[PDB]
Amino acid sequence: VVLGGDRDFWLQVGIDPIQIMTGTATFYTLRCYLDDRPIFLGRNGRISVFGSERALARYLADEHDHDLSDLSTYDDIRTAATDGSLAVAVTDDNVYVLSGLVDDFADGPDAVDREQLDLAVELLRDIGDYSEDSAVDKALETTRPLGQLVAYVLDPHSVGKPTAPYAAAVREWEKLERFVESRLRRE
């Protein structure tokens, strides 16, 4: 019953369009939370990603059985898509950038942008939870080189600065980024 051109459409449907930027691609998808758990536009633990807002809108116009399609407001999205009124819009807090982190970790914590990393870890934890795979939780354990480095960057009151070289953290990040890529299903 929420029309596509309504002022607060995405807020009212309770589902967020998100943007994921990597060094080689920018993707769009949808994500929500149901009883404290992230659910993405996807199926079987893999997130459907789209190269443009138009491609996402085209997909949402079609009948689908995926992890969002039985949510009570999903029909509002599909009807907006078929009405031609769906306006996919990503708010600034739903912009997630993995690009460059692999290079920044190699130069140490001072090369890593804290805000970028904070947002990236938010997405990573959501992907790990949605995929029902422990890869993210394990990699970010603070015993490990990467988890220790991430915790340091995200805490401006920490004096436990990891010391060069950062090769171990880089290797662990590369493995984690491969995991993320394995969970993004190109539609």
Author numbering: 234 to 420
What does the paper say about this structure?
Subsequently, constructs expressing SatSC or SatSN in E. coli were used to purify the individual domains to homogeneity for crystallization trials. Only SatSC yielded diffraction quality crystals diffracting to 1.4 Å resolution. SatSC displays α/β secondary structure comprised of a mostly parallel, four stranded β-sheet core, flanked by seven α-helices. The structure revealed a new fold sharing no similarities with any previously solved protein structure in the PDB based on DELTA-BLAST and VAST similarity searches. Although the overall polypeptide fold was not similar to known proteins, the surface of SatSC had pronounced electronegative charge potential that is comparable to many export chaperones, including SecB. Furthermore, the SatSC structure featured two surface localized hydrophobic grooves, mapped by the Kyte-Doolittle hydrophobicity scale. These grooves bore similarity to the hydrophobic grooves on SecB that serve as primary and secondary client binding sites to regions of unfolded preproteins. The proximity of the smaller hydrophobic groove in SatSC (Site 2) to the larger groove in SatSC (Site 1) as well as their amino acid composition (aromatic and bulky side chains) resembled the arrangement and composition of the client binding sites of SecB. The larger of the two hydrophobic grooves in SatSC (Site 1) was comparable in size to the ~60 Å long, main binding site in SecB. In fact, when we tested SatSC for chaperone activity in the in vitro anti-aggregation assay, SatSC alone was sufficient to ablate preSapM-HIS aggregation comparable to full length SatS.
